[PDB]
Amino acid sequence: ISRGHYLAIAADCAACHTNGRDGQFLAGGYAISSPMGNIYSTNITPSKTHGIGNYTLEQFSKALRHGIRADGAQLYPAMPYDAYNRLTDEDVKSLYAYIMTEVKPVDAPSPKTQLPFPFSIRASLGIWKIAARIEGKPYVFDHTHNDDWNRGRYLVDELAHCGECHTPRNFLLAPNQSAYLAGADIGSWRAPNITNAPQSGIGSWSDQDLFQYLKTGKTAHARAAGPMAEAIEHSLQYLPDADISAIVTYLRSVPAKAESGQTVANFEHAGRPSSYSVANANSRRSNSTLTKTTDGAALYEAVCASCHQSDGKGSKDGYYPSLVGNTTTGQLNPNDLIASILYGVDRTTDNHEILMPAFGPDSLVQPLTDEQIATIADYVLSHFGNAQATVSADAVKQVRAGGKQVPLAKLAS
Amino acid sequence: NETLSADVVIIGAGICGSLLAHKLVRNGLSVLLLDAGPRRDRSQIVENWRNMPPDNKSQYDYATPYPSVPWAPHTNYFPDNNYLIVKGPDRTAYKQGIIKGVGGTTWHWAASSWRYLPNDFKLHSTYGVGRDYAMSYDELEPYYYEAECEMGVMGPNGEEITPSAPRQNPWPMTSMPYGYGDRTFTEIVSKLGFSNTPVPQARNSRPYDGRPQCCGNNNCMPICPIGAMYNGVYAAIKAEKLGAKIIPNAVVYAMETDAKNRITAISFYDPDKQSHRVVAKTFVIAANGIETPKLLLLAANDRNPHGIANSSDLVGRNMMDHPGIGMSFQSAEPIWAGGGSVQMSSITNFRDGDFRSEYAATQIGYNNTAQNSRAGMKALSMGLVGKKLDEEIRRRTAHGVDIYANHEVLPDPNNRLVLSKDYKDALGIPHPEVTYDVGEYVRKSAAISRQRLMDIAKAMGGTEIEMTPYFTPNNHITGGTIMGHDPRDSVVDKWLRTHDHSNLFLATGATMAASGTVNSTLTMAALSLRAADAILNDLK
Amino acid sequence: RDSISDFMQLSAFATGHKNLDLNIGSALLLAFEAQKHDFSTQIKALREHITKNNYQDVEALDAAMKDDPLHPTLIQIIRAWYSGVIEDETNAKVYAFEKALMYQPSRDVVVIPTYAHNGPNYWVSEPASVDVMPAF
Numbered sequence A: 001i002s003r004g005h006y007l008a009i010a011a012d013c014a015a016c017h018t019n020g021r022d023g024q025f026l027a028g029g030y031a032i033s034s035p036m037g038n039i040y041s042t043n044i045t046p047s048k049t050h051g052i053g054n055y056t057l058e059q060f061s062k063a064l065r066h067g068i069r070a071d072g073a074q075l076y077p078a079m080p081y082d083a084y085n086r087l088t089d090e091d092v093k094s095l096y097a098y099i100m101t102e103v104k105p106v107d108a109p110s111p112k113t114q115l116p117f118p119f120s121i122r123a124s125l126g127i128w129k130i131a132a133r134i135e136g137k138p139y140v141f142d143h144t145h146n147d148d149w150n151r152g153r154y155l156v157d158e159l160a161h162c163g164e165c166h167t168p169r170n171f172l173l174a175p176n177q178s179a180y181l182a183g184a185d186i187g188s189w190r191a192p193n194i195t196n197a198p199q200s201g202i203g204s205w206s207d208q209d210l211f212q213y214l215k216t217g218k219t220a221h222a223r224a225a226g227p228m229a230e231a232i233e234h235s236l237q238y239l240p241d242a243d244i245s246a247i248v249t250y251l252r253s254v255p256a257k258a259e260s261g262q263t264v265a266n267f268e269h270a271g272r273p274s275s276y277s278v279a280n281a282n283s284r285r286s287n288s289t290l291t292k293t294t295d296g297a298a299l300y301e302a303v304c305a306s307c308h309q310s311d312g313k314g315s316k317d318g319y320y321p322s323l324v325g326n327t328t329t330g331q332l333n334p335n336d337l338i339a340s341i342l343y344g345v346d347r348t349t350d351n352h353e354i355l356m357p358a359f360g361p362d363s364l365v366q367p368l369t370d371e372q373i374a375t376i377a378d379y380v381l382s383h384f385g386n387a388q389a390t391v392s393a394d395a396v397k398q399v400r401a402g403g404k405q406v407p408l409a410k411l412a413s
Numbered sequence B: 001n002e003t004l005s006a007d008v009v010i011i012g013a014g015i016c017g018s019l020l021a022h023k024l025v026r027n028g029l030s031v032l033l034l035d036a037g038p039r040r041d042r043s044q045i046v047e048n049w050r051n052m053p054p055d056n057k058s059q060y061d062y063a064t065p066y067p068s069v070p071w072a073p074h075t076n077y078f079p080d081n082n083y084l085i086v087k088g089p090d091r092t093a094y095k096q097g098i099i100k101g102v103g104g105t106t107w108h109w110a111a112s113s114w115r116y117l118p119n120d121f122k123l124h125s126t127y128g129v130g131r132d133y134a135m136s137y138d139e140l141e142p143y144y145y146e147a148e149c150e151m152g153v154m155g156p157n158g159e160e161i162t163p164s165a166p167r168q169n170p171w172p173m174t175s176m177p178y179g180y181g182d183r184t185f186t187e188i189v190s191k192l193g194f195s196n197t198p199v200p201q202a203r204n205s206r207p208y209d210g211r212p213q214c215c216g217n218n219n220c221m222p223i224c225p226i227g228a229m230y231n232g233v234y235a236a237i238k239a240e241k242l243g244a245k246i247i248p249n250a251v252v253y254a255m256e257t258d259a260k261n262r263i264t265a266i267s268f269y270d271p272d273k274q275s276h277r278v279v280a281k282t283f284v285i286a287a288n289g290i291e292t293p294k295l296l297l298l299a300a301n302d303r304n305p306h307g308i309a310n311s312s313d314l315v316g317r318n319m320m321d322h323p324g325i326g327m328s329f330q331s332a333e334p335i336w337a338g339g340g341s342v343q344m345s346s347i348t349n350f351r352d353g354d355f356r357s358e359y360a361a362t363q364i365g366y367n368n369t370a371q372n373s374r375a376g377m378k379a380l381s382m383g384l385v386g387k388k389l390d391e392e393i394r395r396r397t398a399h400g401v402d403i404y405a406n407h408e409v410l411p412d413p414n415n416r417l418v419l420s421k422d423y424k425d426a427l428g429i430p431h432p433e434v435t436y437d438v439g440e441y442v443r444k445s446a447a448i449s450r451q452r453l454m455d456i457a458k459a460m461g462g463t464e465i466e467m468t469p470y471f472t473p474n475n476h477i478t479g480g481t482i483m484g485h486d487p488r489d490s491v492v493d494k495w496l497r498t499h500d501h502s503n504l505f506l507a508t509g510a511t512m513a514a515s516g517t518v519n520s521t522l523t524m525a526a527l528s529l530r531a532a533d534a535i536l537n538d539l540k
Numbered sequence C: 001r002d003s004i005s006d007f008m009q010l011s012a013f014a015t016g017h018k019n020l021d022l023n024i025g026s027a028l029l030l031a032f033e034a035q036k037h038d039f040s041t042q043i044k045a046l047r048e049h050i051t052k053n054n055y056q057d058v059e060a061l062d063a064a065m066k067d068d069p070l071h072p073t074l075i076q077i078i079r080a081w082y083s084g085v086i087e088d089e090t091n092a093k094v095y096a097f098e099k100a101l102m103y104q105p106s107r108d109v110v111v112i113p114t115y116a117h118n119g120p121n122y123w124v125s126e127p128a129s130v131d132v133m134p135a136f
């Protein structure tokens, strides 16, 4: 592949500008769930009529690094131009060449993003950019570190823009650079702490485990779901081993940020040698459409024990992950466990597809209510994961609604 | 309920009814889906099966995990609940299993999705026996493929297994690999001269339809714990998501016709025998090969004194299934049943031929259900103790084999489904009653199938060989509302619309004019989608 | 707890397998005592027979008790531990599934149906020998 194609894969610029599996790639039309509403990715194919085919190199650079459209309109920060801002000029030119010469034009306009007032006018974003402190000198190599560290920092910060999801946002929905890579809620999902904190972050992960997770999304203690599965299956599985090694090298040097109430790492929680009762289920025969099953152990056995075993250790070949020692069940924040139960897992790497079915209201296999999901999550947390974490029906409902509403979104009421 | 209006009302939320409802709501029609049974949860059925006694697992009890509701009971044969009365010389061959509820009997089927051979649609024209379908295989092929795509059917994509149904497109998925038992059976019966080929199954050899890949839970009958196979509740859920309205526990019992014999309304009961009226532009009965004729006969009017759509006196007649001979033995060499699904391959060698003018074509198959429960119960019955008990259990689960041979039955007018004059249920509705005779066609086929099964058992060095002296039921209820071109000799036409009532469609296996040789639910689904096309053309 | 301890010891002797679930054993003992009021004294008599005659395994005890009236209850205990049921009806209560001792001698090869073996395509591998008893 070209240098521009490699940069487009590394930056994952096609994971948002392609509307799902269908929706010919780089044509836009993909809806991003922002706190203020839905923002649609635009047509980036070099169509002179509906795409960016009339863009010059300077116009493309402005749109990519500064968030200013060709017209002069401000782009919404759903486009990570705050991360792409420090891309070198050579990388911007390579991306421009790849867009102009290697992606086929698509003549189909994308849906226009309509946001509630006062966010409808994309002219106040200048003051937002001033407050966000985006600029932004182009990246140059730090000569105190080695080349691997610099390349890993460039990949993490400018191309793969990990902090877009792993660094929490402040009140104005701008990056909080004090809590760099300390974990953030990005809707129904939470990107966990990936600092070098031994307990809060990924500091206690083995280097091979981190490499394997970044390359494949699968590890004996961690499985990638939600936005992480998409990031890995669209960008990170195609990166060279040197790229993943550099990312790991940089990540091992990220200063630690501690989480409140953490004593052991997310993957270091042992399992209670406890389970359900087959005898107690005998009263529940002749009781189709389980509503009288309120026991967490019984619900887990009925809905979950088939794949993850009754002891919560999964299958021997590792296809079904062990819930014991798993970073999702071991988090003090049970957001990811709720999201996994609600939406399942779907991750295609090397053309092979992981899938855990969804168990939310829209499920085909077994729809569960907020109370049933909370009960199952509580049983899993007590017996296989973080025993200090708890889940309630309101928490499940909030995850279903798209996470907690940020205070800024209250302005559009 | 006041009037419960809709464009189309479908009676029965089975695979046929739910697929029809989904296609209709996907095309802008207002749909009312009625089911006499309750809503069911898969995980609760899984728990019920797990807490079902091991003797009920060794002997294939497929109905106990699904509780039977008194207002709309279904069949149970551990201890027989007498919902379906069967008479005749071959009554044992019509002791069939049905499940009532949203999702229907496909809640607990094996999910063997089969396309019929082209000759199977013109049997009488080809061999001079039975009846010809009102349509050809070429007319049902697009709907065959549509049902396969919706249901997620895997099959032997690159393979010339035998003369089989010609395809225009490959299967949506490729067949998952065989387990040890299927491989061993294939080599043995290939040495025997039989062609063991993969069964096309509505099962996930890869993640499909947002549902997991099959991990080989080997409990397809009676419940998949993880949804790696198709159940009609999927189509019901998708239809409801698109605006279809579903009323469970809606036991339809009455129909009203106008001066043109078009249906104007239907009446159903709730569990408390309260009557509700439903008016629609189009009425579809998708209940069963048993429940559809029962509803048609029970709803007799003054305009239709002998039953709805019974001007030909054929409603309930020509009842068909695939009569079966079962065998079980202990193989000399280990077979290790249980790898993959419960039905992974079958001998398709004798599905067609020139012999079909004399005796029935057949399907010989090997059961892949795990024999661990059966081995444990049998070894406990021998009074063994200690290490001998464990050794016996292990040997018997490694060596136990279940084998079957299913036959094709011709449509016989005296194979009938009259309403019973001796038994009723809570709502006072009479029980179905079937008089069944297999016929000399199947008896001559069985004289050969028995020798074939004996040859299979001998080739495997089988001991403790046990054949059923009777015929067994295979749950593919066809006939009862026969299709054809002549209104004097059939109940519905090629579009599944009844001849008597232009308002009424019957999306059921009872419409099928021949039973074929293999499982018939895929043909049912294809015919339901064809009827969906007809209904859409009628209402637009 | 004396009755439970005696039942669990006699069960470990009768089934020949030391690792038996205590919750399953407690439920089985409660069901056995509900069905038969004199179950505990029969358990004590069987244990007295074992200790007095110094039987090494259940094979010798079964061989030397083929006609004594305590044979049916010993066979019933073995059957309850292996099958997971005590009665013989289609509505009999199930006290153990996937932990019943009759699914264990084939666990390394054969699926306990509603629970998965390792992976969506594990059955492409060759099975183990019938002559090698796994575990437990």
Ligand SMILES: Cc1cc2nc3c(=O)[nH]c(=O)nc-3n(C[C@H](O)[C@H](O)[C@H](O)COP(=O)(O)OP(=O)(O)OC[C@H]3O[C@@H](n4cnc5c(N)ncnc54)[C@H](O)[C@@H]3O)c2cc1C
Pocket (backbone or CB within 6 Å): B011, B012, B013, B014, B015, B016, B017, B034, B035, B036, B037, B062, B072, B096, B097, B098, B099, B100, B101, B102, B103, B104, B105, B106, B107, B108, B109, B110, B111, B112, B113, B114, B221, B250, B251, B252, B253, B286, B287, B288, B289, B291, B292, B295, B474, B475, B476, B477, B507, B508, B509, B519, B520, B521, B522, B524
């Ligand atoms: C154990 C088993 C295994 C099987 N395996 C296979 C297989 O491998 N391959 C295959 O092709 N087929 C198989 N079958 C057959 C298959 O299950 C049926 O052919 C299939 O379900 C088609 O049924 P249906 O959709 O016509 O109606 P069903 O799903 O049987 O019933 C539809 C609904 O009608 C409702 N109903 C009935 N009467 C009324 C009324 N008066 N008012 C309102 N609602 C009513 C019922 O409650 C029910 O929910 C199997 C069957 C069994 C029992």
Ligand code: HEC
Pocket (backbone or CB within 6 Å): A218, A221, A222, A223, A224, A225, A300, A303, A304, A305, A306, A307, A308, A319, A320, A321, A323, A326, A327, A328, A329, A337, A340, A341, A345, A347, A353, A354, A355, A356, A357, A359, A376, A377, A380, B212, B226
């Ligand atoms: C029933 C109530 C549950 C619960 C509580 C969980 N699962 Fe599963 N699960 C399955 C697979 C294949 C995966 C991982 C994907 C792969 O590696 O390709 C998972 C993942 C999870 C997680 C999180 C793991 C991660 O780190 O994100 C959790 C907390 C979890 N599951 C809990 C497989 C299955 C099933 C297959 C048949 C079924 C059923 C379930 N899971 C059900 C449940």
Ligand code: HEC
Pocket (backbone or CB within 6 Å): A155, A156, A160, A161, A162, A163, A164, A165, A166, A186, A189, A190, A191, A192, A193, A194, A202, A213, A214, A222, A223, A224, A225, A226, A227, A228, A231, A247, A251, A266, A327, A328, A335, A336, A337, A339, A340
């Ligand atoms: C870019 C270079 C990176 C790197 C190095 C990582 N991520 Fe993410 N990530 C996201 C989410 C939602 C999750 C958790 C999902 C769940 O709750 O199941 C993760 C997870 C990780 C981990 C695992 C941490 C653990 O203990 O589970 C690691 C090591 C990791 N990430 C590193 C979300 C996102 C994104 C959303 C837009 C983006 C971009 C990234 N992650 C990018 C990166």
Ligand code: HEC
Pocket (backbone or CB within 6 Å): A008, A011, A012, A013, A014, A015, A016, A017, A032, A039, A040, A041, A042, A043, A044, A051, A052, A060, A063, A064, A069, A074, A075, A076, A077, A078, A079, A080, A095
């Ligand atoms: C990887 C290289 C990459 C390139 C090159 C790129 N984007 Fe965008 N992009 C957007 C959104 C959303 C907008 C429009 C929002 C706005 O108007 O403020 C946009 C706007 C643009 C525009 C403005 C042109 C127009 O018609 O609006 C260009 C050019 C562009 N992106 C190019 C989401 C993304 C995402 C989301 C995950 C990613 C990654 C992303 N974009 C990556 C990239």
Ligand code: F3S
Pocket (backbone or CB within 6 Å): B203, B213, B214, B215, B216, B217, B218, B219, B220, B221, B223, B224, B225, B226, B227, B228, B229, B340, B341, B342
């Ligand atoms: S029970 Fe399910 S996991 Fe597969 S073997 Fe049958 S579809």
